[PDB]
Design a binder for this molecule. Structure first.
Ligand code: QJ1
Length: 127
């Protein structure tokens, strides 16, 4: 079995910014979800070898996880908040696509997504 290369977290060709919204995405949004009891399956790319999921990357072609998001935020990979928000939504959508309704992992994603929505609802206006 083989995992794909992880999503990139560094690209010197890519223009970068540090905006107040991106600071909020790290200091509030990521930190809230990262410390949650249900964060652990989402803190790194899905390891299809260790978890014995040989079809995972046959099904999921745009992988995303909070370890990648954390690195992107800490290394100022993004230009805007919408890129980061899209990464979180990709992570949740992948989980709902691959897994079955009512699975433990889906209940975990739902709890994290609820908090995500609560925090993004108060995303600050851009400075
Ligand atoms: C976000 O992680 C995933 O979607 N995976 C696909 C199968 S569910 C599995 C897990 C189930 C219960 C704990 S961990 C994690 C890996």
């Amino acid at each position: 079995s083989m995992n794909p290369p992880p999503p990139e977290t560094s690209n010197p060709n890519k223009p970068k910014r540090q905006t107040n919204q991106l600071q909020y995405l790290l200091r509030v949004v990521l930190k809230t979800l990262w410390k949650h009891q249900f964060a652990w399956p989402f803190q790194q790319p899905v390891d299809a070898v260790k978890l014995n999921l040989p079809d995972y990357y046959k099904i999921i072609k745009t992988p995303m996880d909070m370890g990648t998001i954390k690195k992107r935020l800490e290394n100022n990979y993004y230009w805007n908040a919408q890129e980061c928000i899209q990464d979180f939504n990709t992570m949740f959508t992948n989980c709902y696509i691959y897994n079955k309704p009512g699975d433990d992992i889906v209940l975990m994603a739902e709890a994290l997504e609820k908090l995500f929505l609560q925090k993004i609802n108060e995303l600050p206006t851009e400075e």
